[PDB]
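Q: Predict the assembly, please.
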Amino acid sequence: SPRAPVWVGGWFVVGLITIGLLTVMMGPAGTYTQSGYRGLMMGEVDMADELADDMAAPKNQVPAASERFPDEGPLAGEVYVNVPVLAHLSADNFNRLMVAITEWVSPEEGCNYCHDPDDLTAERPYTKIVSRRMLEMVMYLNSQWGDHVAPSGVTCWTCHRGNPVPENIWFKNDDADGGSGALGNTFGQNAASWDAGLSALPNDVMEAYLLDDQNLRITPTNDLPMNGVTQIGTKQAEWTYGMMFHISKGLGVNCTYCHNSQSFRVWEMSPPARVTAWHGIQMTRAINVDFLDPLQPEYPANRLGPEGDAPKANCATCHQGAFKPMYGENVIDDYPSLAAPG
Amino acid sequence: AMLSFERKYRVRGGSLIGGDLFDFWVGPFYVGFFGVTTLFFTFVGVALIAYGWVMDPSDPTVWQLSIAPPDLSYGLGFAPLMEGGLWQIITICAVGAFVSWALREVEICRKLGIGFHVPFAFSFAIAAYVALTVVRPMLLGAWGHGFPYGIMSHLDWVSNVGYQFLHFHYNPGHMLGITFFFTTALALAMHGGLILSAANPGKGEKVKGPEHENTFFRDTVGYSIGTLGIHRLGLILALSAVFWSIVCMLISGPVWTKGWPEWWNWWYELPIW
Amino acid sequence: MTFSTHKVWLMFDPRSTLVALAAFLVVLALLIHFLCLGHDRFNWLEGNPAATK
Amino acid sequence: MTFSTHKVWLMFDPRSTLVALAAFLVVLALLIHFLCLGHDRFNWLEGNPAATK
Amino acid sequence: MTFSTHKVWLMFDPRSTLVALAAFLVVLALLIHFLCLGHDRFNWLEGNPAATK
Amino acid sequence: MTFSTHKVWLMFDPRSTLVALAAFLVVLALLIHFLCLGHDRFNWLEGNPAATK
Amino acid sequence: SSTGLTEAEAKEFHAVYSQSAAGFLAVCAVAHVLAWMWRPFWPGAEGWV
Amino acid sequence: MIGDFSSYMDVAQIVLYAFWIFLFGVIFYLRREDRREGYPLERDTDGKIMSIGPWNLPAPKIFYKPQGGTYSAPNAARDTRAIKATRVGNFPGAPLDPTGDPLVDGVGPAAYAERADTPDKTLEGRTRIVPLRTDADLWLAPEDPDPRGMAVVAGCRTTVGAVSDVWVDRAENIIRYLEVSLGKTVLVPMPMAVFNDLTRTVTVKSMDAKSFANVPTPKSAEQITLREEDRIQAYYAGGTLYANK
Amino acid sequence: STLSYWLGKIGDAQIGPIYLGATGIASLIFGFVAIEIIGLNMLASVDWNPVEFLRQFPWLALEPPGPEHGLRAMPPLNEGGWWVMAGFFLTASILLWWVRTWQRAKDLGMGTHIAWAFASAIFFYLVLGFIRPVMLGSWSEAPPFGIFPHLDWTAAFSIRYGNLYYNPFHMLSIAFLYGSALIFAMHGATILSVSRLGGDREVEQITDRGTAAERAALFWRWTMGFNATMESIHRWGWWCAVFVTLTAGLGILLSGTVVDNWYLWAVKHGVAPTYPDVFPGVTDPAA
Ligand code: BCL
Ligand code: BCL
Ligand code: BCL
Ligand code: BCL
Ligand SMILES: CC[C@H]1c2cc3[nH]c4c(c3C)C(=O)[C@H](C(=O)OC)c4c3nc(cc4[nH]c(cc(n2)[C@@H]1C)c(C(C)=O)c4C)[C@@H](C)[C@@H]3CCC(=O)OC/C=C(/C)CCC[C@H](C)CCC[C@H](C)CCCC(C)C
Ligand SMILES: CC[C@H]1c2cc3[nH]c4c(c3C)C(=O)[C@H](C(=O)OC)c4c3nc(cc4[nH]c(cc(n2)[C@@H]1C)c(C(C)=O)c4C)[C@@H](C)[C@@H]3CCC(=O)OC/C=C(\C)CCC[C@H](C)CCC[C@H](C)CCCC(C)C
Ligand SMILES: CC(C)=CCC/C(C)=C\CC/C(C)=C/CC/C(C)=C/CC/C(C)=C/CC/C(C)=C/CC/C(C)=C\CC/C(C)=C/CC1=C(C)C(=O)c2ccccc2C1=O
Ligand SMILES: COC(C)(C)C/C=C/C(C)=C/C=C/C(C)=C/C=C/C(C)=C/C=C\C=C(C)\C=C\C=C(C)\C=C\C=C(C)\C=C\CC(C)(C)OC
Ligand code: HEC
Ligand code: HEC
Ligand SMILES: CCCCCCCCCCCCCCCCCC
Ligand SMILES: CCCCCCCCCCCCCCCCCC
Ligand SMILES: [Fe+3]
Ligand SMILES: [Mg+2]
Ligand SMILES: [Mg+2]
Ligand SMILES: [Mg+2]
Ligand SMILES: [Mg+2]
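A: Predicted assembly structure:
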């Protein structure tokens, strides 16, 4: 059969209509905000519809709080028996806090999730024991970690968001290691893991930084090597990078939110959000070391991890994909009881 | 008539505006209407870059010189001359100068009676520059999306734009462009070496012809592209590299607004598995 | 092929067939030895206890 | 192909057809063996209990 | 190949066969030596205790 | 090759064989010296104690 | 014809091919029966329990 | 510190400057190789040879050609053929105007180089470009249309003739020229021809009916020299500027 | 020696025959051992499942030893010993392939220019995998054998040594890669434009200059004021391609050995741009 010469103009029109196909197919274009200097391109790249949907998500709507009773009446420590951490609240405020906590942690299961159905005084369920340490942790976070959580504060809704198990929790060997026998060592990486943003980066970094105090500072403070300072660290850089993937995914931001890529090391070129993130790293490590990990004996086997360790919190446990938890909604002003230990 | 064989080729013709006024040479360079426009835009742009250099309060060196685009708040509008307007005017002059260079090459090709493959290939570099400074900024709604005109600051722009997606290496168009750029260097090394080996066979050997050239690659890789096929292959490789660079930058921001590694969830969670 | 199919070599070149068979057999032996090294019970150089569960 | 379709070898070259079927059979055998190795119950070298659940 | 099959060299070129065999044997020897060095009990230069567990 | 097998060089080029042997021997010596340097007991320039454990 | 074989050569090649393929399939069936007796490979409604 | 020579200088800076020296030397060497053809330069007004330093012009290198002979570069040979073009006033850079027919004279885009007056050979010493009617070991791939028999249309939409044969490169298996019998036979370079297999036509937009009648022809009808090839190709290339206008 | 219609459209249609020789067979044996090691470690990393292998192949790799092993000549297998073996066998196969290319050039009477262009890439590969880890005394500084992992290594290497954009040899290597693409597009377009004049037959144009070479030279002379010859442009391209990997090896040698922070190196030498302080009161909270 004769070969037909290619219709250049017709295929050019087809190319134009395919460009239209691409435009309708793959974007109304993302919305930009500029945080740094011009020409640097430090800022946020967000789809407007997706950002609006995440703000209008049910988890980002802090439940309405009832009017607070005047703190002048019979305390909860005399009316009730087993209230070691809430013995300074007026009984009316104690009941208001119980209702709020039920709305925040177990709205579906109701008051019976953390209480014996026929005895509110009995510390039978493990959930009551865990909730007491939850209350203590929230008070500790509000009183002692205002460098990070103020002025918004943290309540039971900040992590739990209306269900007993918070959405973003982690364990020690959260990503199953690969390799059979003497072959296939994945080295805690080389997998399509969502902890590393679906990259082949170290996906089990939360243990080194949010439970351990390992160094995230890989970049030297001098241009030339020192005699006692290490001259290597490319693989150690991958651990920091994976941790920064976790941080970026937990806040729904990019690297430029806290860094100038010209030098990831220089704080003077960094947005003031990097200072809040430093306090956040310290606070998350404190949370895991002091409250969430020592709760392992109180958990059933259904709640533990592959390594038998307690569930732990990270940047994404509170923020849930936003730069601030619930995008900055104040949650502690309505509940002064959760703002400081008694 | 500078080269020993150039006199017979210096004739009238090739103008794209239909006129003999600009048809002349200054030294080795051919001057056209588009040569004049190229020099006009070039001197304007270079003088404005020097102005922005001497008006910089930080006393930068040649490496630290930077004429930055306007803020993203100015949108697709007009900025003060010291607040992005200088970058805008230099961008307009650069686009004009590059298009004029391509059109002058078209004029030279018409005068020499050869094909327009060179202006056409340079149009791909011009399209990459335009997609970086004009098209992508309009797709994103602000001229502040273009890169600053500085030797070292445009590297910082590249770095921060890449880290806006948390791992730019995972961009599929970026992967394709890098593959094509590295393959272009591989093919250029192979071709230059083969032609130099055929033209310089050594001591006691005659200059090898097309049979030896084809035999060397059929004996090494198992396939010979030929002497006409190698140049088509090289042009195609370079043009594909630049085209995929344009695609990867036009899908970053206008299309993809999240991390690039998670785009591969289409393959990791393909409906098959 | 069988002990009596001597005419297969009127269709397959003995030299090339022997070379391809040697390459395939060496590759398969390496594969199986690596699969034995890639399992705790059958890695004879690691010397794990035979009972592995 | 059937026991009576002896004229298929008037269309396919027997030597090249046998090398493409041998290659395909070896690749298929490798794929199925690796599929068995890739699952807890049918990995005969890992030796998990048959009730993997 | 046996002590009496001297006619193999009328079918296999001695020079290329010897060079390919030398290459294969060197690669095999290097691979086995490296596999021994890659295990605790058989790295003779690291000198771990023989009782490796 | 043996002391009395002098007809090697009627099959193998003496000069090419010598150059290839020199290259192979130099590379092998470099490899084994690197092996010694890469182990604590046999790194003679680092001078660790012979008792290494 | 096209490949360059007589119908008699093709018949002999098909005879040996059919014998070899039948032997291969018989060995594969025996191996599959042996593997089923080792561990059945079609799960029930409950799985591998 | 580790890689420092002073409080400012360091090893990387010195290695960078050493590479700068090496790169500038390489560029100098490359620019010397660029001057193996066309140098020394000449003036645009009287043809006076300009003096170039011996450090910019390399010593001649000898090419031992595959079929015999030695080419040197530079070679002290200068193209001094009379150009049939004039200009008003010998001003530097003033372009020239052909006196007569620029295509036949070889002026500008029709200009050609005085190459070897012998046909190009292959490794075995047989003519590289020959018509397909002479060689039986070479045929045309059945997947591609056969140019032979196709009508030949010039740039003025006039059927000037038909394709009678194809000249094939025996060293690369590629069609180099089309032998076109004008409705008396001419060679059309294949890159200058566009094929339409549905209408069975070959369009050569670089030629008119007048230009086809003046196309240079090889001395032999089965043999073409490098100079004849060069002249014919230059004629068709100059037709892009001088034919349809 | 089969034919290929599709490849015969862009170029020639003949595929083969290929000459391997002694060094070719040796290189294939070494390289197959390396590839088997890498691929079997990748397949074992997904617990031998080919479904998971297909899912995760870009993410899979053979990983170098950790920093805890240093430059141990042969680490434990599943702790980087497989990587060291794969690197050794790949290096041996690549070196034997270089010898093969040199020999193929010699036996054809041709110059050894492709071999010495391959030597530059081999130098870069060796700096990446062997030479630099030896000087730094750590196998961990070497790239993994994986698709996405060596991109992760690339990014983490740039991050570890302070923005490799500020490495002057990285700048030079990028300039030379851009110039390789530029020069090769220039040359392909130029030769295609003079293909109507016989310009694709470049070696015949080298020993006998035709109007194609003259017009190719004059186009660039009239465009940018200077030109090359039909042979010199190939030296230009050869050197531009060689310098890519030469400067790449040079800039990787200097990272961690003599320079540990490249951005601070540029700050010392007045290369890093200084930007107006948009964030006036941000300091290190750990200071
Ligand atoms: C093994 C001995 C004979 C043979 C004996 C028979 C007999 C008897 C029959 C077939 C039938 C078929 N054969 Mg047969 N067949 C042979 C070799 C082949 C080869 C090959 C390239 O080797 C192929 C692709 C096939 C393909 C096929 C199918 C296209 C066709 C029907 C599909 C089917 O029933 O199962 C689906 C396909 C598969 C499961 C994969 C196909 C591959 C295998 C080899 C198919 C063989 C199935 C057959 C029942 C084997 C019986 C041999 C025993 C000695 C009984 N045969 C050899 C020469 N074959 C049947 C038919 O024509 O339909 C009415 C049929 O009754
Ligand atoms: C070493 C001295 C002789 C030799 C003497 C013998 C004798 C005697 C016998 C064989 C046998 C065999 N030889 Mg032999 N064989 C030689 C060289 C070779 C070469 C080669 C290219 O160098 C190869 C690939 C082989 C391969 C083989 C096998 C195909 C075959 C049995 C397989 C086997 O034992 O499994 C293991 C095979 C391998 C792991 C690969 C092969 C490697 C070595 C060289 C195989 C030698 C095995 C043989 C039993 C050792 C006997 C040598 C003693 C000095 C007697 N021989 C040289 C020329 N060989 C046996 C046979 O055919 O009987 C049915 C047998 O009885
Ligand atoms: C060194 C002096 C002689 C020599 C004298 C002998 C004598 C005597 C014998 C051999 C034997 C052998 N030789 Mg020799 N051999 C020489 C050079 C070589 C070369 C070479 C390219 O240089 C090679 C590859 C070989 C290879 C071989 C083996 C194939 C064979 C078995 C020995 C062995 O253990 O294998 C392992 C091989 C290697 C690890 C590589 C081989 C390298 C060296 C050169 C092997 C020499 C071994 C031999 C004991 C040296 C002793 C020298 C003393 C002064 C006697 N010889 C030179 C020419 N060779 C033996 C044999 O044929 O068995 C019946 C034997 O009795
Ligand atoms: C080893 C001795 C003989 C030989 C003797 C026999 C005998 C006897 C039989 C076969 C049969 C077969 N042979 Mg045979 N066969 C030989 C060489 C080969 C080669 C080869 C290229 O080396 C191949 C691919 C085959 C392939 C085959 C199969 C197609 C076929 C049955 C498949 C099978 O058994 O399942 C498993 C097959 C494989 C996993 C592929 C490998 C095949 C193996 C290597 C062949 C040996 C199997 C045989 C039963 C063992 C006899 C050897 C003893 C130690 C003496 N043979 C050599 C020349 N072969 C059978 C048949 O045709 O059925 C009617 C049969 O009865
Ligand atoms: C100037 C610098 C550029 C460059 C140069 C360069 N590279 C080169 C050359 C040159 C000039 C060569 O001569 C050489 C070559 O041959 O190229 C085609 C080579 C080469 N450049 C290569 C790749 C390459 N170059 C790269 C880059 C570049 N190379 C630079 C940009 C890159 C990148 C971007 O990372 C890569 C990946 C190779 C194609 C080749 C060297 C090949 C080699 O080393 O082979 C030995 C290694 C092996 C693993 C052997 C193969 C093992 C397989 C298992 C083979 C199959 C065996 C099987 C038995 C076959 C039969 C199977 C049966 C079923 C049929
Ligand atoms: C498309 C494939 C590749 C390509 C092709 C290509 N480029 C080409 C050609 C071709 C085929 C030419 O014919 C043409 C040429 O003549 O080359 C010698 C050209 C050319 N490629 C050039 C460079 C170049 N090509 C590049 C890339 C590529 N070119 C691709 C990889 C790059 C990169 C990657 O950075 C550069 C720098 C020029 C040498 C030349 C075009 C010269 C030209 O346009 O001249 C007219 C303009 C001026 C003389 C100056 C104008 C200045 C402005 C008025 C102000 C400055 C604006 C600028 C944006 C500032 C930048 C600051 C910092 C970012 C540094
Ligand atoms: C009205 C008025 C004001 C009049 C004044 C007129 C004046 C002053 C001038 C004329 C008008 C104009 C516009 C002049 C231009 C001025 C300028 C700015 C000139 C320089 C522009 C320019 C792009 C310069 C070169 C820049 C660089 C570094 C380019 C890269 C080149 C490179 C990497 C290597 C060089 C390799 C070469 C030489 C390649 C060319 C080349 C190629 C590509 C072949 O394939 C080929 C094939 C066969 C034979 C020869 C060749 C050959 O020479
Ligand atoms: C199951 O698998 C089968 C069998 C099907 C085979 C398939 C295999 C497959 C699919 C393999 C895929 C492999 C891939 C995708 C590999 C990708 C690799 C990439 C991208 C690598 C990138 C960079 C790597 C570099 C630069 C590595 C360099 C390493 C070097 C130079 C190491 C040198 C080491 C030496 C010289 C060691 C010497 C030995 C000493 C001297 C130490 O001994 C003491
Ligand atoms: C788990 C998230 C709980 C839910 C659901 C409810 N309560 Fe609670 N309760 C919880 C804790 C941790 C404590 C101890 C307080 C302390 O200071 O340690 C309590 C205690 C009470 C009591 C006191 C009973 C007693 O001491 O005798 C009462 C009366 C009580 N809570 C009431 C109550 C109501 C009404 C709830 C539904 C709105 C409810 N609880 C849910 C934890 C949790
Ligand atoms: C705010 C939520 C941040 C985001 C977004 C990113 N980073 Fe991070 N970075 C942040 C802090 C608080 C710190 C200091 C941690 C400490 O222990 O001091 C850092 C530090 C780094 C570093 C190392 C700096 C050094 O001195 O070596 C690197 C390499 C780094 N950050 C990289 C990085 C990347 C790649 C990011 C995008 C994925 C990214 N950061 C985002 C806070 C925040
Ligand atoms: C100059 C007055 C102060 C600033 C007013 C706002 C200027 C920006 C908004 C208007 C112009 C932007 C849109 C321009 C479109 C140009 C399309 C070619
Ligand atoms: C001060 C630094 C000087 C650097 C000079 C570099 C010169 C490089 C020359 C390379 C080419 C040499 C000639 C090769 C001809 C072909 C040989 C087969
Ligand atoms: Fe070329
Ligand atoms: Mg893990
Ligand atoms: Mg994890
Ligand atoms: Mg966001
Ligand atoms: Mg010092």
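The pocket of heme C (ligand 9) is lined by residues A 80-86, 95, 98-99, 101-102, 105-106, 111, 113-115, 120-121, 127-128, 131-132, 135 (CB under 6 Å). DSSP finds four helices and eleven strands in chain H.
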